[PDB]
Paper text:
Ferrous [name]-1 binds O2 with a high affinity and is pentacoordinated in the absence of exogenous heme ligands. The tertiary structure of [name]-1* conforms to the three-over-three α-helical sandwich of the classical globin fold, where the seven/eight helices building up the globin fold are conventionally labelled, A, B..., H, according to their sequential order (topological sites are numbered sequentially within each helix;). The [name]-1* heme distal site resembles that of A. suum Hb, with TyrB10 directly stabilizing the O2 molecule and GlnE7 making a hydrogen bond with the B10 residue. Taken together, the observed functional data suggest for [name]-1 a putative role in vivo related to O2 binding, NO scavenging or O2 storage.
The diffraction data collected at 2.8 Å resolution on [name]-1* crystals grown in the trigonal [name] space group (two molecules per asymmetric unit) were also refined, yielding Rfactor and Rfree values of 26.9% and 31.9%, respectively, with ideal stereochemical parameters. Superposition of 158 Cα atoms of the two independent molecules, in the trigonal crystal form, yielded a rmsd of 0.53 Å. Comparison of the [name]-1* structures from the tetragonal and trigonal crystal forms yielded rmsd of 0.53 Å and 0.42 Å, for 158 Cα atoms, depending on the chains superposed. The only backbone differences observed in the two crystal forms are located at the N- and C-terminal residues of the polypeptide chain (residues 2 and 159, respectively), and at residues 124-126 of the GH hinge. The crystallographic dimer is identical to the quaternary assembly found in the trigonal crystal form, where two crystallographically independent [name]-1* chains fill the asymmetric unit. The rmsd calculated over the whole dimer in the two crystal forms is 0.50 Å. The dimerization interface observed for the [name]-1 dimer is tightly packed, the stability of the assembly being granted by several hydrophobic interactions, hydrogen bonds (also mediated by water molecules and, in the trigonal crystal form, also by sulphate ions) and salt bridges.
Author numbering:
A (entry chain A), B (entry chain B): 2 to 159
């Protein structure tokens, strides 16, 4: 069924209630991702040097994660809104990968994120099998390129 | 006049001859921008540490601007592609301003950059008045949120 264009629409809709901004509610969506991420996937807190043991409250009243939650949420809207333009989509992912090499992540998490993120959108407002499948379509596309680039950069890949 | 969808389309089309990628051709599309930048706006070389006196040959033989070129070009691609979504656009502008805090730039250069970009586009190939005015409408929005963000961030602004 799913072509480049249809995936986008789907993904963008999922996020239309989780819009980025400068206001309290806009800052909440950002912060809330890490609250959920840290609660249910606490073993990945390692990469977050110093936040490696943060409880849901520590993140809630933090400014590091009000900055970092706003950055991740703005990244995820970016992926949804440019997916239609393949070469640029692949471009952005390569940049994501580069700015992540410093933490030297486990090269399977590039898939895992969308479990967390769909699991986060499924935790805040609403979702569906069509939307969640599009995110996974974007994920396969993300990881598809993410590995190609990891093996291209002489780096740990699967 | 002209609208968000109209701008998007014109701004994107003008960029198909300067696409991002891993091949030799794509990598120079970012590189040639700096070769242009430095050859026509030398007084702005001050920002690029170590590269304040660099030439076209210096930039060409540099693997630093190969990295750095793809980044600015990608950034401008994402700008053209997400323009239809205003909040995601505003978000990416605030983020761009954030990532430029360290250089403490002349706040007037946020408008000025697009003059340079269309300048580059015309040096490379085809760029019509509609394509040029579209970028100029896009820039007038980028800059608008630039100064707004810097204002409520306690940093200098025009
Ligand atoms: C699920 C696997 C991931 C892990 C373990 C991870 C981990 C991290 C960590 C530890 C940081 C730095 C936080 C700090 O020290 O303050 C970071 C930054 C960041 N991450 Fe991720 N991340 C993951 C997935 C992603 C994905 C898929 C995206 C793209 C949508 C992304 C986008 C970003 C952005 C935009 C930043 C900060 C700004 C930048 O470096 O450009 N992350 N990440
Ligand atoms: C004439 C105005 C501008 C100047 C003088 C300028 C200057 C710089 C400098 C000094 C760097 C550091 C890179 C290095 O040292 O190798 C940089 C990186 C970068 N610039 Fe700009 N910039 C300008 C406008 C813009 C605009 C409008 C954008 C938005 C598309 C942008 C996007 C970026 C990006 C994405 C990077 C890569 C590093 C990062 O993301 O933090 N720049 N720029």
């Amino acid at each position: 069924s799913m072509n480049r264009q249809e995936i986008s629409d789907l993904c963008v809709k999922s996020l239309e209630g989780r819009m980025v901004g400068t206001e309290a509610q806009n800052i909440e969506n950002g912060n809330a991702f890490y609250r959920y991420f840290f609660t249910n996937f606490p073993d990945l807190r390692v990469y977050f040097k110093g936040a490696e043991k943060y409880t849901a409250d520590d993140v809630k009243k933090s400014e590091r994660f009000d900055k970092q939650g706003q950055r991740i949420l703005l990244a995820c809207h970016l992926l949804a809104n440019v997916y239609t333009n393949e070469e640029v989509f692949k471009g952005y992912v390569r940049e994501t990968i580069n700015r992540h090499r410093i933490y030297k992540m486990d090269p399977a998490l590039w898939m895992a994120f969308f479990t967390v993120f769909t699991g986060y959108l499924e935790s805040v407002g609403s979702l569906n099998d069509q939307q969640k499948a599009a995110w996974m379509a974007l994920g396969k596309e993300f990881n598809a390129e993410s590995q190609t680039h990891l093996k291209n950069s002489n780096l740990p890949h699967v």
